[PDB]
Scaffold this active site. Structure first.
Site, PDB file in Angstrom:
ATOM      1  N   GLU A   1       8.107  -1.479  -4.022  1.00 29.57           N
ATOM      2  CA  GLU A   1       7.583  -0.503  -3.063  1.00 29.57           C
ATOM      3  C   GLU A   1       6.109  -0.856  -2.896  1.00 29.57           C
ATOM      4  O   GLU A   1       5.362  -0.815  -3.818  1.00 29.57           O
ATOM      5  CB  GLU A   1       7.823   0.928  -3.522  1.00 29.57           C
TER       6      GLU A   1
ATOM      7  N   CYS B   1       1.089   5.889  -1.029  1.00 31.09           N
ATOM      8  CA  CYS B   1       2.010   5.001  -0.304  1.00 31.09           C
ATOM      9  C   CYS B   1       2.472   5.617   0.986  1.00 31.09           C
ATOM     10  O   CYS B   1       2.946   4.888   1.825  1.00 31.09           O
ATOM     11  CB  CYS B   1       3.254   4.722  -1.169  1.00 31.09           C
TER      12      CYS B   1
END
Ligand SMILES: NC(=O)c1ccc[n+]([C@@H]2O[C@H](COP(=O)([O-])OP(=O)(O)OC[C@H]3O[C@@H](n4cnc5c(N)ncnc54)[C@H](OP(=O)(O)O)[C@@H]3O)[C@@H](O)[C@H]2O)c1
Lengths: 492, 494, 484, 487
Positions: free
Chosen positions: A247, A281
């Site tokens: 990720e 993120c």
């Protein structure tokens, strides 16, 4: 906190004895130290995980879940300690630290609840006296690499599913946040994780990082962090064909259509931009506002951003950036924008702060107008409390500006038009679309994205199943002679 | 025959006009040519796939399935032409060529049957007026890189699910086997695949392979072949974070316990070693036989192995190796085994054939005794009609020897003991375990493996699902003011 | 123990004031009473379930699971009491009382763990701007009806998944075992289950049973017990089309092939026949032993059966039967079996005022001993000599729940997995069923099943939402465009 | 068309020789006979099914699927024959008939595509050397009971998944529409269905109905029709515990919020009320329109309904009711309505004149609690009412014993997402018409029936899940209640 290594069931120092100091991003004061682990330390950790694998697998998911739930219980009973560690190492405002720890607890629970529920399959064979059994089993040794931005939460997210499903683990946290990982590991140990099943390694990613990911015995790598690190991991994992869960953040477009509820959109934007000082993120990284409401929206956005308090976690709305390097890179980003002709509507520098906070890595909410769609402000991840805004006029243009990105994680949409909501659900080519609400992601969602986001994903059935390999057993129980089409029977 | 490119709905020549020769493995002579695509031919092909993407997605799976079923029917009607191309390009025995085409037809049917059945999910949100919708959508542009060993099977395996799921496709087949791929592609074209949805690019992987795989617009790479090429693709695809589906062959142990049925084990071993001359991702690559029966087993296996005819596809039991370099590599392997003290029980050289076959790349069935578990014959993929054998005497030992490999795809076990069968299902750490039966794998199976086998898998619900991306939509429909724990409500009060 | 009713959040008496005695099967004497609920009280329970539904539904599965987990913790903390209720009401040996309470705890955990994992679906629509959403939602009001044989286990089995999935519940336990069920409800209430969501009604099923199951607001009936009552419920439930979950017991064939491990088959058979005195939905009810080993098998089995101790829960290997009627019925079965020329190898009679029956071993395929459920410590044995014969004798039954196979032949094992047409086949091991299993069967077994993802999903209804978001004029094939 | 019984692979007459006439709903004239099967014929059909079972199961789904796909192909080649049978037996307009035949084809395709994809499961056992294997297997003998309203579609809907999954079948169509069922049966036989796998029985519900559903060897009953018949089937299947799949029709509310697109709402309403003369399990049966637009909406609804042509299948927009009993029942519905204070806004009687036609009927100002708003019509009659709040709209909709389809027209996304939970109906069509798709799970709440049809979940209703618990320790067992020392 001076942290140690945990290898093959013992807390030890680095074999070299070398260490690295940790500084508060709130005050600049040196507050801790961690062991700089060697390559031989990594080998001993990985070999301990190998030697523990078969007994840990054989325990079965129910017995494993009992240990995991005991870990959760010990974490919840002692939760203040973890909240304080997060505030100290990261400078998070207190409510963010409490929420993060709530999330550690929620995630550990959620993943443990998958005990005896991740079934394999039985399918028809090529005859009535054949079947294909498909077992789901663990990959083996999992290397977990955690970032600094959610240093407790990311540890829970990776350890919990990995252990539940019967993998052994070597965890290496960010060098900026070793204390939160150590504290969690120690809790799993206290709960009764057996010798070698869970190992903990700290050290310079630039001295042991490649070595950990390329090691021949590593079966799976689960990692959150920067694009460039992720790219490097995928290159180095070609040596062992490890399964990758990566990720790598994003560049979330935050899209406000003309019929948006203004208050809800602004509330959600304060959260998406300024939660964890934009070091998320899924942070709002590009703002697109319909031209009919752009001026009001921006006037209000600026007025609210000015009321955000920066400073001590006891009382602040926003914390500091993680280290001097983040502060320097954020200054550069702002100067490059100014140099390209962008206009600063608010912020663009450090605050003027009193007492010990004057030496921390604080940066003001920063709002930019006049930056092009093609600019670095709009195309390159900022990971700081900085955002550029632009006007939109059509739904098709909205989708294109949003999809015009090498990133593909989160996105936000505010509108009351059902046709836009249902159509955007396919046309916005992002892994997460938040419609009329903020993040963060839920454990039951599959956190993933498109383009440069990474590999596989986390959460949901599909996320935990990423830690299970499916294998096939083809059985023939006819008990009669085989006939094989290309083997002449004339031979038998 | 001469192959061309299919780019943006036209058959075209390479933009440089250059071509590459194709050799017969039966005769060793040139029998065809294919176009050497340039970097600019690749760009046009990927660009056509991008521009066709939305309209292919938007047809839906049912309509895409109708076109794919049509292709299946056209392939079936004209199957003989494909059978012939495989016999000509690969030198496969006729029954192997017919079986491969059977498989093309079965696979295309099976993948197309997944139409409107690969559902997304709806999950509970974090309040009663929140839900999380999980949609399954195509990745976008799929690059399909096929090997020479099952040059028609592997094309069907990759194109059917990629297309059914709504991805657009750029196919580049092995330089040893352009013809069978081209022929399949043309059937998809004749079935009505729209322009841009399917593109066909030939050229050496050493020349354009890196370029295709690292391209900014590629979303998914589906590939089958050698370990080294897989490792390279993974390194290059670090540039775009493409989703990888890689299958990289194996070193399948073949295990025969003392209670095995001898006839069945031998029949299956003949298949597992010699089918496609051992040029199979699931070939028997290491033979482990229980000490009680090793002597009878090896004697019977040698005796059966001598009976196999080599030569013409019309009548041979086993065909040639694919090319001169596979022949040279096989001789080196046998030589390194002989120079290491290994006993050749049978074979170990090219046969002596007259006529055109003398220049073909034939190699005899080759059976080796006393090479170590740790030797190259036991640790490095062979992909040729060569196998070593070793004794075993305990179940624990059997598992450990089997698992002592950098490979992890297929494996074979013959026994009547139920405790060994159920226990081996977990303790044999291979993607496929065949118990008292041969391969090949079935379409309903998830073809995959451990360790150096590769990434993801193919076949089954899970295989086709590798070509769909899950995406989430979090919706709040309370219609009420939001409360966010870290945003002060006094910022929104009078 | 005196039990009461729990209706819309209050412990109350029956509005008639009437009550019904409960007798000990160990001593034969009265040891407790429970309220005989009226029609009135049923209607108040069901209306309170209706009134609580939407708020229970809207809490979501995570918040419901927290309550269910707290219930489990309180049960576990006080487990000695429940174990004592089961030994007092059923007479179960101490080890079996402890087991049943282990499975109450195990089941509640397992069902609670399904929180936020029972997803709905999204499928493609009939155009690109059409989707079909498939939500899984509660049925609404659940009626749970439990048997006496596992009086605590069966309550946990039905309450846990019904509540996790967001249904409200009216529970009516067996009139032989109201005390264990009450004690479990009390724990759920103590855990914080809100008003109306869970209700508890006692009263003879022969007096208020049809009224409950026929009631117009009941959306789901979940029941275990005898075949005759299940059949009756399915008739009565035609009134409302309630979704049915019925587990009706069985007539398990216990098959021992010539290559079986004799010790493991005998150990297992001792469990399968005599666990809970044979009063089990998966009890061994028919013994088939290959002719090669029949003699030795039966000689050793008899030797082991005679060594079982009976009497007090503290000391015994096997408890009494539940009540006087079951004692009379078991005698009737044995007497009929003898009157048909059955050869008694051992037992066939009672062993003071309790309802103890001796292990009874009989030494004909179509007789009542082989075709009718016994639910007592009695079994007949028969020789077999082929695999096909074995499958057909097994399957020659109106029942279809559990079955047992002892063999080392993998071809029989894999083939029996399809040819033995029973919901459960135990190969080289005893029961009981696991919660990850789908407890179900064929033929007269019942409807649906319990356990596994499939079992918990029986308490959820799938509904579809077809959405068109083209924002364009619709074109309908049989509606003429010229009208518009 | 004279139909026969298909029993154990042979076409045969009733053992009594008796037959029953079939009438055209277009003319009222006799147009066919069918066989009145005996209880003995039924026993022969079911015994055939029993005898065919193991060999059918053991073929596996791919081989079964091939036979099913061939049947589809033979159906599609000869589709005019079926279309004509539907127009003759039911009197549907040509495009409804064509529609129904496409759906026969689509459904047979959809169900056959489930070959080798309906997997069992493997779960962890209670020790590392135990597993539990969960196989999905056929129920065995399936009795299919089809209605007259979609007399080809419903036969496909039941036969294709029952057969794919490896069940043998005894089909009994509605005594009003034996022709379309028989034609379809003949195509499966032509495609290669083996002896006994598929049997076909016709006769009077009052001679063989109970007998078929209660028979000892029946494992599963799949039925569509009326509430009353479903209730009786459920009573009688207590004798065998057959698994049931019942779809018993509905009382669909059709709800038009203030912000609806008027043209699209009206189009869909034309479809939902008049399609197959309202003889639809998902027909609009109650109309609720927002008070702000009620007047204009009802106004246009009457103007449009006046224009629908009744009569011959070649040119009409709406055909007739299936038989005379449905004709008299509809009149008795419209009369009960006027006798209770209801206003007729259009229609109310019959409008080739010997046939069973009935005009579009729009009833105003009737009570939500009235027979018109609470009891299934199954005819082109509809009652309307005003609404003014979302919470009211839900409560009115959910105020019914039925629970199948429902329709909603609105542009407010908070009503759409909230209605998806709050409208307690198996199917909710939002800004579009029916019919249901093969991928949807056709089902409902309250008196709608049992289980459902379509989707993965629907074909799975024809498979039974069984468990196999295996211990492979190879070691002595330990059982908590048994002594080790005893051995
Ligand atoms: O009224 P309707 O014709 O609209 O719908 P319906 O009676 O529900 O008819 C649906 C199906 O059920 C059958 N049926 C009738 N009585 C039955 C019984 N006692 N048991 C089982 N099936 C029975 C019907 O056959 P019939 O058409 O022969 O009555 C028809 O095939």
């Amino acid at each position: 906190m001076d942290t140690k290594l945990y290898i093959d069931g013992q807390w030890v120092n680095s074999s070299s004895g070398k260490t690295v100091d940790k500084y508060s991003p709130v005050t600049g004061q040196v507050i801790g130290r961690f062991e700089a682990a060697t390559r031989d330390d990594v080998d001993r950790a990985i070999d301990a995980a190998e030697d523990a694998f078969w007994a840990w697998n054989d325990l079965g998911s129910v017995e494993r879940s009992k240990i995991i739930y005991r870990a959760k219980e010990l974490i919840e009973k002692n939760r203040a300690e973890l909240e304080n560690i997060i505030m100290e190492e990261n400078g998070k405002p207190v409510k963010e630290a409490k929420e993060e720890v709530d999330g550690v607890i929620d995630q550990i629970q959620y993943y443990a609840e998958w005990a005896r529920k991740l079934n394999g399959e039985v399918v028809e064979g090529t005859s009535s006296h054949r079947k294909i059994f498909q077992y789901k089993v663990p990959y083996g040794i999992v290397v977990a690499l955690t970032p600094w931005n959610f240093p407790a939460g990311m540890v829970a997210r990776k350890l919990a599913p990995a252990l539940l499903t019967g993998n052994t683990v070597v965890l290496k946290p960010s060098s900026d946040t070793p204390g939160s990982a150590e504290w969690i590991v120690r809790k799993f140990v206290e709960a009764g994780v057996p010798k070698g099943v869970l190992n903990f390694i700290t050290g310079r990613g630039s001295e042991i990082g490649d070595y950990i990911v390329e090691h021949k015995k590593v079966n799976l790598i689960t990692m959150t962090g920067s694009t460039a690190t992720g790219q490097r991991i995928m290159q180095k994992a070609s040596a062992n064909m490890a399964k990758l869960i990566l990720e790598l953040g994003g560049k979330a477009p935050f899209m406000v259509w003309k019929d948006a509820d203004m208050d809800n959109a602004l509330k959600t934007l304060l959260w998406a931009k300024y939660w964890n000082a934009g070091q998320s993120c899924i942070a709002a990284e590009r703002l697109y506002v319909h031209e009919d409401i752009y001026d009001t929206f921006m006037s209000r956005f600026v007025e609210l951003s000015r009321k955000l308090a920066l400073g001590d976690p006891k009382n602040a709305d926003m914390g500091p950036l993680i280290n001097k390097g983040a502060l320097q890179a954020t200054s550069e980003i702002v100067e490059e924008a100014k140099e390209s002709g962008a206009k600063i509507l608010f912020g663009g520098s450090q605050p003027s702060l009193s007492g010990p906070y004057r030496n921390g890595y604080f940066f003001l909410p920063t709002i930019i107008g006049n930056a092009d769609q093609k600019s670095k402000i709009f195309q390159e991840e900022i990971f700081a409390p900085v955002i550029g805004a632009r006007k939109i006029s059509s739904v098709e243009e909205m989708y294109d500006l949003a999809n015009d990105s090498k990133y593909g994680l989160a996105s936000y949409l505010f509108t009351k038009d059902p046709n836009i909501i249902f159509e955007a659900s396919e046309r916005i080519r992002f892994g997460e679309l938040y419609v009329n609400m903020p993040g963060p992601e839920a454990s039951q969602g599959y956190h993933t994205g498109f383009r440069m986001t990474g590999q596989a994903g986390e959460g949901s059935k599909y996320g935990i199943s990423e830690y299970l390999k499916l294998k096939n057993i083809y059985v023939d129980y006819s008990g009669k002679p085989l006939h094989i089409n290309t083997v002449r029977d004339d031979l038998f």
